[PDB]
Motif scaffolding. Sequence first.
Motif, PDB file in Angstrom:
ATOM      1  N   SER A 141      -2.753  -4.672   0.099  1.00 44.61           N
ATOM      2  CA  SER A 141      -2.200  -3.521   1.017  1.00 44.61           C
ATOM      3  C   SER A 141      -2.812  -2.189   0.491  1.00 44.61           C
ATOM      4  N   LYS A 192      -2.305  -0.522  -2.182  1.00 37.05           N
ATOM      5  CA  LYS A 192      -1.472   0.076  -2.878  1.00 37.05           C
ATOM      6  C   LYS A 192      -1.997   0.100  -4.334  1.00 37.05           C
ATOM      7  N   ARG A 238      -0.731  -9.209  -2.857  1.00 34.35           N
ATOM      8  CA  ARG A 238      -0.431  -8.275  -2.022  1.00 34.35           C
ATOM      9  C   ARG A 238      -0.632  -6.832  -2.178  1.00 34.35           C
TER      10      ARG A 238
END
Lengths: 332, 332
Positions: free
Chosen positions: B251, B253, B247
């Motif tokens: 994302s 990130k 994730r």
Amino acid sequence: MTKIFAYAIREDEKPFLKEWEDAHKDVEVEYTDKLLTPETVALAKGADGVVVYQQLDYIAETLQALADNGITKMSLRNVGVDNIDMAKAKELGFQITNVPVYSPNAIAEHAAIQAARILRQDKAMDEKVARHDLRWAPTIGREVRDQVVGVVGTGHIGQVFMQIMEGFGAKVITYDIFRNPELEKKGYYVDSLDDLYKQADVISLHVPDVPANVHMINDESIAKMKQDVVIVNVSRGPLVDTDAVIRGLDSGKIFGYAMDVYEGEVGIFNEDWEGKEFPDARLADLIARPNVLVTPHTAFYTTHAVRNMVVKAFDNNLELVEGKEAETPVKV
Amino acid sequence: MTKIFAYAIREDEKPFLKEWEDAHKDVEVEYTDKLLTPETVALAKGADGVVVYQQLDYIAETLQALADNGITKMSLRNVGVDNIDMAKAKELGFQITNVPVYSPNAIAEHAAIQAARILRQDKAMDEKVARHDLRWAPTIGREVRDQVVGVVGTGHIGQVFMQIMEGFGAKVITYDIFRNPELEKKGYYVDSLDDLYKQADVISLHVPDVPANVHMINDESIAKMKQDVVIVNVSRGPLVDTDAVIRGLDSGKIFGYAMDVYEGEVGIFNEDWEGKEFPDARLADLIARPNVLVTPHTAFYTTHAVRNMVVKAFDNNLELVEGKEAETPVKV
Ligand SMILES: NC(=O)c1ccc[n+]([C@@H]2O[C@H](COP(=O)([O-])OP(=O)(O)OC[C@H]3O[C@@H](n4cnc5c(N)ncnc54)[C@H](O)[C@@H]3O)[C@@H](O)[C@H]2O)c1
Ligand SMILES: NC(=O)c1ccc[n+]([C@@H]2O[C@H](COP(=O)([O-])OP(=O)(O)OC[C@H]3O[C@@H](n4cnc5c(N)ncnc54)[C@H](O)[C@@H]3O)[C@@H](O)[C@H]2O)c1
């Protein structure tokens, strides 16, 4: 208006360009993605100076269309002052700057990483894993710290590379024609290139493309080298005789080769040859070997370097335009 | 018959094994390439000790079977003890050693190199070069010296990882539950993990797989990390919630992830799956991401490491067998 016109601006340069603009809001900054050509000069008409970056020669015709458009101040975002028709320049009273040093660590880190990868046989390992061959054997690595690392050239880049390799714990020897006293105190230098070749597991070159060094890596120097030597070249293509390295690789003497530069790169590097007939069979072959790492003259390409290339080019142009001593003027 | 029986011996270990035997002619050594399980335990019969190396768990049943064959002395060739049934081992008065320091550099260098590759976008670069796209842009790199490097665990490996990262000129911070005086004098340590997560561009884990450490890298600690963080795990799979990292990658990130280890590697890693149905779609997906570098638990796989893993293991085992003091005994 203090209007700087920039050519060949890349997407990844924009962030440093914006930044430069925000520190000089009184300056008018324009740019194109196009390269500087006798037909593109007309675009800088009005500007007080141009910031440039391209291998496309700076043809008299070009310089001439520039001056005819009122521009005579030129700031290179790179080092090279080679594809500049210099006689023309001096003629039109051209003021020229470049960017000599942007990020030495960019190139030294790349050499370091590529060497370590070759020692580790990381490419053979990556190839196994991509095919889902997750067995260890036989791809065993060699630690960097277990190596003697020979640095040829101890300029800005070479010293950073030595720094990095020492950090790994490698025994670092060096060779340069002019010994920097600090390094000389330290004991890094060996007396002859031959002393380097006999004791280095890893050789990296950080020396200019000067005629006395052209093909310094050849069948005769390779025959001097240690069994399982690793050679790195991120300086200049012509330092290395590619066919002799291919011979070295083929006889199993050369463990691996990392090259960021190639004696036939001009016209090959920086082109997409996907779905097309690759122009250079020898390079295509090198690219596919498991123990060779080819990068298309990318050692400079980092956010740090690119930052300094942009900013410093624009600082020099503004300085030319404001009748200030330029930080990095080119001896015309 | 002062006898030592060794498991999971590989071709690349044999050279080291004979060096050991040649210095201990009065000891009989037998080995198998097979793993130590309940059903292979029988092959130790006759030996006085056992030398092992495997990620496959040393179950209560395997341990029982060892004993039920006379063995209560076990020397692992590696560092980690997280896959041994300690409760069963203690019940049986097992004596266990490991090789805590076969080569902290091997793993540390692997970590540094993978982190640098990810910072450089080297995988994206390599894939377009293999396609014959020799354009460097837009694949810009991030220098190692521009990063804040956060080292979780300042033990044998973390300390060498710090060394290397400092050689690159990066700013190094650290977090260990136990602080090293010499390190702490330099001011490397931050007060908590949260502090490290907040400041680190690059995070590398160098801690053991202990209960308190499981999934220390999870959606909650990732939310605390900086934008474009690079995470490196060469220690143990379960330290990292793999889906959380995925994730974090999806994302935007997490800039990239270097993993040598994986939750679920046992039975996958060190196996050939070429032309077979890959058993773990999540791992296959990771392997093929441009910003993920997967190695199959090969951080340790260097010639320097493998010699020491073998020699110290046998040293240790001889000591156990001869009732002398093992050099690097484990607590049961
Ligand atoms: N691959 C890339 O992206 C990239 C980017 C920038 C620069 N470069 C290259 O990197 C090279 C290094 O640049 P730099 O800034 O370090 O230059 P520099 O002038 O600072 O370093 C050159 C050094 O080499 C030494 N030297 C010359 N000839 C020698 C010989 N025969 N033997 C041993 N030492 C010798 C000199 O005395 C000097 O110390 C440049 O020449 C350039 O071609 C490549
Ligand atoms: N991938 C591989 O091939 C390989 C090879 C060797 C070791 N390893 C892994 O790496 C681990 C580290 O090895 P090492 O030799 O450095 O061990 P070490 O025991 O020297 O270091 C572990 C350190 O982590 C610290 N620590 C423990 N939990 C922590 C936490 N939650 N936060 C911060 N610090 C913590 C301890 O205080 C100690 O300083 C090994 O336990 C093993 O799991 C992997």
